[PDB]
Design a protein around this ligand. Sequence first.
Ligand code: HEM
Ligand SMILES: Nc1ccc2nccc(-n3cncn3)c2c1
Ligand SMILES: Nc1ccc2nccc(-n3cncn3)c2c1
Length: 394
Amino acid sequence: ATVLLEVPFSARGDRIPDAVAELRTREPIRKVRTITGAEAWLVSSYALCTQVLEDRRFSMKETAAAGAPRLNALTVPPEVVNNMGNIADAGLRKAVMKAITPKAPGLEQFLRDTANSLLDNLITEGAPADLRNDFADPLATALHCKVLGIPQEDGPKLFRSLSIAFMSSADPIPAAKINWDRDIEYMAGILENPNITTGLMGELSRLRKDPAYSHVSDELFATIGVTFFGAGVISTGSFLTTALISLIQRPQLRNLLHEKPELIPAGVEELLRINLSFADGLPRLATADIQVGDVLVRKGELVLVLLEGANFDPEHFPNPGSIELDRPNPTSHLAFGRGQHFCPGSALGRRHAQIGIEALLKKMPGVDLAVPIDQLVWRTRFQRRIPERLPVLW
Ligand code: HEM
Ligand SMILES: Nc1ccc2nccc(-n3cncn3)c2c1
Ligand SMILES: Nc1ccc2nccc(-n3cncn3)c2c1
């Protein structure tokens, strides 16, 4: 006898397991066991992933219901699982969405300046350099302080909550509550702090005193700050780190983007498509009995949408493991999700990566790994796949 197939399959974010394609061919929806011991349906074709993400009877917020089968333990209060629903119900969606585009005057200049400063520091100090801790993640952290309107010097302490906040644990995590409560208190103080007048938090600070929002809770305003900083920083920092590995691995693409930087947006879209940064399928709970391929999913069951199952599906993306800058469907990947919960940070996340890559290629056109690729240490039991350090030379 063998056990029920366990997820996740591998924490390594530099290569997809050959097992994913086998799985998608033989059983593109199949039962698995999660780290909590719960059963779930793992969906791994493009067709069935899209079906689940576009059908709201597969619910995000019902994953937080007490007693549901769980992918992992909550690290936020259960009402925060419906965060963007709560933002929309408060009449804040338009405003929040507006504040996190890359469009604000000065923002792109700020990202280039910041990327260049981090890279000049690395060049002064001499190789090897850690492009996760000393480039991608500080770039993400600086970006999100600017987008929120909060002091750059408050970035590092907020960032150090994230290695716990974004854990994928079988059990509740006592430090996640300590850091959540502390970070909520910080964002409630930001809303009361008259120096904060710009960015997302400057905007929510004004809307909080406007009569159209007088009954929106102070708790929701603070929660938007904590959640958007943390999710945006983890998602952009982790994507840019694993995208740099994929680029550094492909010297010809490196050289092509360095020579023709106008191709960087197409190259970032393919780096998004192939990205392995999400460590787990996206979870949903069925609220009805729903047919998915050859399975009737029953009400109350957990479904996990494997993004790399969709994004490496050769029926949708032929020669799926190759980066090709001339595909006829380049933005049709699921790296930002699909449907009701499609990422509102997508444009910002694209621009963070495009600017970080353009700056890296101009400053370190010879960038290469400084260790054999197998020596990267992949973080485990985390909601993202990320190497703990990314040592490079140039
Ligand atoms: C390259 C970077 C990013 C990637 C790959 C990414 C990916 C995703 C994915 C896959 C989803 C859908 C989750 C689901 O349907 O279960 C999502 C949702 C979300 N993302 Fe992003 N994200 C990125 C950057 C951002 C940024 C910069 C922010 C904000 C500053 C952000 C905020 C959100 C929020 C608030 C949601 C929830 C939307 C909802 O429930 O409707 N993300 N992201
Ligand atoms: N436990 C925490 C603490 C801070 C957070 N900040 C942003 C986003 C979080 N998570 C949302 N889901 C999982 N973490 C956070 C989770
Ligand atoms: N950037 C992301 C990616 C996946 C997410 N999954 C669930 C909830 C999210 N957030 C809702 N608000 C902030 N993040 C998510 C945010």
